[PDB]
Subunit: 257 residues, 4 copies
């Protein structure tokens, strides 16, 4: 709990978190509530999201959301403003991570599976960021003029994609590449934009694993979701982090297989 001078405040800030019913998004939601923030959990899975909001208590709300939907994205923003009056932080954690070869025995990679991965991972992340940015721009200027922080989730697959990861790598590389042009624009509103590229974490995302985990130099294990949430926490607090993609991966460099 020691902080630097001119650190940004996290207490009483309102977080919008996608994929919040599980894995990384669930961990960010827990971290934020435990740090004294408010959280609006967004997930397509109502059972998981309602359970998470219930477990977190009155600092949390759940809003069922398909992140690729214009309507649902707008409703998520509206839900946050209804509950807590503002939005300060968006963390995009919703994603899918299929494996499918370009060429298999049973044919070429289906176009629909590529399109779906792009839709959820990349279009969904953009949809939430454009709408969250619009809401954040309405905030009064905080310390140094800051109005909000947007944190996206890429993957080490954006850098070291394995056989079978064309769709996933394309989607996450697209997320990564957006960070800079979005940060450049949203600077005039005091909204920072950052991306975390996780390695292998213990989540439902990759539901072979053991072999990947054994290839992680140090620590020689799957990541704890709370370690991803810790980095989110630091990005929120450290105003100089902007426009960058941070690998959070134990120095993993994935092999082709």
């Amino acid at each position: 709990a020691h902080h630097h001078h001119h650190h940004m405040q996290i207490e009483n800030r309102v977080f919008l978190i996608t994929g919040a019913g599980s894995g990384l998004g669930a961990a960010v939601s827990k971290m934020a509530v435990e740090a004294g923030a408010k959280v609006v959990l967004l997930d397509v899975n109502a059972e998981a999201g309602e359970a998470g909001a219930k477990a977190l208590g009155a600092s949390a709300r759940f809003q069922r959301t398909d992140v690729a939907s214009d309507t649902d994205g707008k409703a998520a923003i509206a839900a946050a403003i209804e509950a807590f009056g503002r939005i300060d932080v968006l963390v995009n954690c919703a994603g899918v991570a299929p494996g499918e070869k370009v060429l298999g025995r049973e044919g070429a990679h289906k176009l629909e599976t590529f399109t779906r991965t792009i839709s959820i991972n990349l279009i969904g992340t953009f949809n939430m960021l454009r709408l969250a940015a619009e809401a954040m721009a309405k905030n009064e200027p905080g310390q140094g003029g800051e109005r909000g922080v947007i944190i996206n989730t890429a993957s080490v697959a954006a850098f070291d994609g394995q056989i079978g990861q064309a769709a996933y790598s394309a989607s996450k590389g697209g997320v990564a590449a957006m960070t800079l042009p979005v940060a450049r624009e949203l600077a005039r509103h005091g909204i920072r934009v950052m991306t975390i590229a996780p390695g292998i974490f213990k989540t439902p995302m990759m539901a072979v694993q053991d072999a990947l985990g054994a290839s992680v130099p140090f620590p020689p294990r799957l990541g704890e979701p709370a370690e991803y949430a810790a980095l989110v926490h630091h990005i929120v607090e450290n105003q100089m982090l902007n426009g960058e993609v941070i690998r959070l991966d134990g120095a993993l460099r994935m092999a082709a297989k």
Copy 2:
């Protein structure tokens, strides 16, 4: 003099998207002049038909939406019908709109972001999966090589400007795909490379006010001008020849590092 090579492009068959104009038209001209056969693919029928006509009997055109499963399959079949095989795919089809995340009239449209992704990223994947399937049937040539796939990203994948969220996302996705696709297709002797062009004299650029074009050229350290599409095509030619180039994104940009505006 000679250019050291494995793949000899004479009588090999190129499938080229965006071939009615700009970079794809330049690749098509380069390939025909090097003795290759070319199947030009474009949504612009007028431009594509005129290009194939100008190039002569070594060229064919088929009007194609690269994001369509149907049209992609029809394009492969058209190439096989005309020329019996496919050796090289060059994905040049793309759109490069500018639109702010937060505009005067509201947030960036979801539909426009989706369209840019669809044409630039989904279309490139669609053509690569289908071309790879065809190439995998080829007899291995020099050094075991069955084919080469070359995609077009952009410097916007690295230095995206204000207004380029969609374009940067799409081209960053193309760039990031290169490795996992190359790793897999290596098993078939099919190389996968990406070129990230800087600012080139394309139809869109040529349509801009001269004062604007001149300012864009001035942002490029050397040569301090717009790139000529034939220079992009020359790099495509080198990638085809140089078997050691694989799994990489090459910036072709005069050392440009785009500013925010």
Copy 3:
């Protein structure tokens, strides 16, 4: 609130280079205020002695040329003598001259390029090899961790300006080392990370005309100001705590992308 962590920095020992000023002074202040012990290393005896004095009994200073085998070994031994162990090394020592490849008075001096490399790159390697040797003796702590090494590169490793050949080379070398060193030192539970700072309020910067400092701040998208050394130190603190950060270079730069001039 809490910050999720493995390494607890209370009563752990930091070795910090360039500790008399700027970033290294800020790391030293951060570490002492978090309950750590600090061994400040600098060539500037006056600044180093004053810093250790201001920090109190949890700090020591030893005058050290980081590029010297002898001085590096003496520094390790001094830390072990005072505090019994070394847990964290932070390499902040550096020089950032500007000198053109082709100047008015002739080509860039070879001697000045060599000096910048010597201090920034050779000095960082020298201290990391010796600190790693000491850390490898530590009892494994939380999650098997014996130590953390954090190096300082620069945005110049990515976007080097005119005049920065030597600085960019040195800092690009630091950046590129991170992975092979992390891969090896993983066998000892020692993590290796690099921070690439943008424009910070260091002694050199503070000495520039205000008009100049103000223009530099204006080049940074957000926050549109010089970085505070304590913000660099805060990232150092986070790296120590967050065991999953390893083998990476983190830009801490306000989204700055330096122009050529």
Copy 4:
């Protein structure tokens, strides 16, 4: 031999090539002579360099050169001007590629071996580039104002350094990182600056290899030095290539060991 409109001419251009007595530098020397250029071979090894110049014929000269020496670098430039009257292209191929762990049984990595690798690979490359640039700036402006091309050699170790490659990776990453600030400056003189990052080639440089070679996705072999020279040739001819590092590696991504 088909070229694009506005291609830069290679015939009768004068190449200065370091490390020219073996491996990649020897291949560039052969390529350039066979393409109708003049070559001044630079190497510390007089036996190898003299043999190479003899084999290439009257289009070639040898000048013994320690690339890290100010005096020898100046003499190399002077030798080129004496023989051929100008310098058009510099290709820096001289390098050493030792393997040494940070921590071994017999102690920490020697400081002297790190310093030597830096000296030859990085300081030597800078030394030759500063002096070649100064000579190139004296040329009359060619097509589009171009006066020269400088091509440096990094390595895949600049990206994917293995255990034991601290020195090599540092040196080659330093080379890579210089490309942009040097290109930015030398643009005013019409001198382009590019870097090639080779993977594993069949040269004396790496005198384990078989395992590395088996990890190269395609082509599944060591690189031919003539393929590196082919890329050099294309960089010389293609004016739009500037300020960039090109991996030439068969899609190799080196594992830790």
